[PDB]
Structure 1
Amino acid sequence: MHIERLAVDESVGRAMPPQRFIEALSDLGVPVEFAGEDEQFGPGDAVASFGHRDAFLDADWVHCIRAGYDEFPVGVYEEAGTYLTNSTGIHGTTVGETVAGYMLTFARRLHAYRDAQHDHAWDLPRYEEPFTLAGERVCVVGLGTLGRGVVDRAAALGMEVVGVRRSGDPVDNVSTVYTPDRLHEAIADARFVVLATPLTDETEGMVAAPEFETMREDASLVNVARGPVVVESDLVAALDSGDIAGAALDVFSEEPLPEDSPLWDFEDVLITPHVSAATSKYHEDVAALIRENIEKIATGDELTNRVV
């Protein structure tokens, strides 16, 4: 096909300033322009956006600036003949680092020390509290971009790494790969269980009371996927009961996390506001995907990360 301009929907501001992205693409080979929420599109238009608007169905191509596309109506794009791509592939370093940071925070007790800092308290941990990630086990559920970003960093810190993916096939830096059939075996002996799957009707509610029972009482859950992969109320009950020790949570069933959620108040819960992938260079990272697909369009090659 033939792209005549890239419209940058104002919604991209949920992850990056639109002007930074626009200017980053000054040499793309088609003009790039800010688009407000009430604009119309037509033949030749590509649109980069955070979320979906029905107006985009008059464009030739929509690039979702997120990895997760579970809030796009994929069926309506098919019918309109509008291509849809996502941003999978670009979040491995940011998420991987964040998750390494969560794990090190728990091992080295940094969050407890931060709490004490507010009170000007020189508070020493219990002797049994501080440990090293070296030699501890992590299970990574989902072994795509996010999961591999986590795996690589965990392995380099000397962790024992296992994980779960649909094929069960070997993955670089993972000692043992399990199919989803064997989730309970995969999580049972892990100090950390990390969720890195898309939200689909197959992964929704995957981690609930029975999984928390299976998990070690000294283990922590990490959710950087989507909130509804966990049954949130079961997680609260598990934390209350001591079925698991704690959790690092970047995503929730309702975001922003409501103020009356019990999750805020657990010492060994870390709440982060859907920012495990945040980066001051997100504009460059998304721009690279746009450049790639503009080359594919020019040459008549299949688009990267095409959803429909």
Structure 2
Amino acid sequence: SRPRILVPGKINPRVLERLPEMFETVRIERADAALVTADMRDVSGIAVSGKLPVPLMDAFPSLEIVANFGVGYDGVDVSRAAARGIVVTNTPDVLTEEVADTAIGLLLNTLRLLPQAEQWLRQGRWVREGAFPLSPLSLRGRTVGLFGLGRIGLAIARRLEAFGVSIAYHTRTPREGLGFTYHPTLVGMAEAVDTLIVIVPGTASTLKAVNADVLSALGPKGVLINVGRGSTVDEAALVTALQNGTIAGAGLDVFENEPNVPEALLSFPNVSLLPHVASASVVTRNAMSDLVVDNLKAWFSTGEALTPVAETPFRRRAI
């Protein structure tokens, strides 16, 4: 009858609310193949946030589609999905402006120490000790390099244009038409700028791209902001750079092994840390939920997904 969709582990309840429009939902408490039972072998689709282990994906012989919750889909083995003729979809565009907003807020919090200033006030220190100390850093006069200048990178750049800072970017291919300075290497951009915003996907090509050399080039007024994926930053090298004063500060929304954050990173008074919140408003998460479900609905009703990923430009063949 109706296609059966597996939802492994946690997902926004709006996905679960709307799947009954067309589907039966099969739930397992974590993304683990050991929890797959014999009566689940007819599942035809997955809706998932985060990791989809290959053994779990491969437990389903009739699987046609993985609808990833999020624009980043590095938790899905897209190479393996493609090899099996399985379409993978993501949630681009509906979160672009939200994530760009968060990126700017994180940058300002990192530079001006706004969260720290609020803690000073809330702990009664304004009354008892007087003004919060002046922030050594400011956005004024900074030069910002965007590592990534895609949907979200461009949206961040557009915001930054209005703040009166210089904007440069690094990507594998330049985007002609824009009036921003292209750098063909990450390290060369880092040299040239004092503020590096990371907004690339977490792929093999970006793994630990922000390394000791890049951090050294960024320099002693350097501020690193990561709103992409944790894997793109060498977290150990960042902790070392911060400890040595190789750079001035950092703002991070994403980490190597979420929800674990290394103890050393928590120590620094010149670092802002967020628990992967860049898209995490009710409105934007509702829109992401809608796009996951609408991808599944489009696939099963029309054979054409709404937002398939680049690696799987597929159309449904019904078997």
Q: List runs of 5+ in structure 1 lacking aligned partners.
A: none
Tell me, yes or no, if the aligned pair for 1:9 and 1:49 is still in contact at 8 Å.
yes
2:182 counterpart of 1:177: yes
2:212 counterpart of 1:220: no
1:195-214 to 2 correspondences below 5 Å: 195-214=198-217
Q: Which residue of 2 aligns with 1:35?
A: 27
- Measure, in 2, the Cα distance between the counterparts of 1:302 and 1:264: 42
Q: Which residue of 2 aligns with 1:11?
A: 9
Question: What's the offset of the Cα at 1:34?
Answer: 5.5
- Measure, in 2, the Cα distance between the counterparts of 1:140 and 1:125: 31
Q: Which residue of 2 aligns with 1:48?
A: 47
The structure 2 residue matched to 1:165, chosen from 171, 187, 192, is 171
- 1:263-305 Cα deviation digits (max 9, x unpaired): 0010111111122221213132331354256446645547533
Code of the residue aligned with 1:99 in structure 2: it is A
Q: 1:191 to 1:114 in 2, by over 3 A?
A: farther
2:275 counterpart of 1:273: yes
Q: List runs of 5+ in structure 2 lacking aligned partners.
A: 30-34, 313-319
Question: What's the offset of the Cα at 1:202?
Answer: 1.7
- 1:141-166 Cα deviation digits (max 9, x unpaired): 01122312322222233332211111
2:63 counterpart of 1:59: yes
Question: What's the offset of the Cα at 1:249?
Answer: 1.1
Q: 1:6 to 1:151 in 2, by over 3 A?
A: farther
Q: Which residue of 2 aligns with 1:97?
A: 101
1:257-268 to 2 correspondences below 5 Å: 257-258=260-261, 261-268=263-270
Code of the residue aligned with 2:17 in structure 1: it is E
Code of the residue aligned with 1:91 in structure 2: it is L
| Secondary structure in structure 1 of the residue aligned to 2:282 | coil
Question: What's the offset of the Cα at 1:112?
Answer: 2.8
Moved more, 197-206 or 122-131: 122-131
- 1:230-282 Cα deviation digits (max 9, x unpaired): 11111111111111111011122222224x52000101111111222212131
Moved over 6 A (4+): none
Q: Which residue of 2 aligns with 1:288?
A: 291
- 1:203-232 Cα deviation digits (max 9, x unpaired): 111111111111131121011122221111
Q: Which residue of 2 aligns with 1:137?
A: 143
TM-score (structure 1 length as normaliser):
0.82
| Secondary structure in structure 1 of the residue aligned to 2:9 | helix
- Measure, in 2, the Cα distance between the counterparts of 1:171 and 1:219: 28
- 1:165-212 Cα deviation digits (max 9, x unpaired): 11122364x521223xx2223222433211111122221111111111
Tell me, yes or no, if the aligned pair for 1:64 and 1:85 is still in contact at 8 Å.
yes
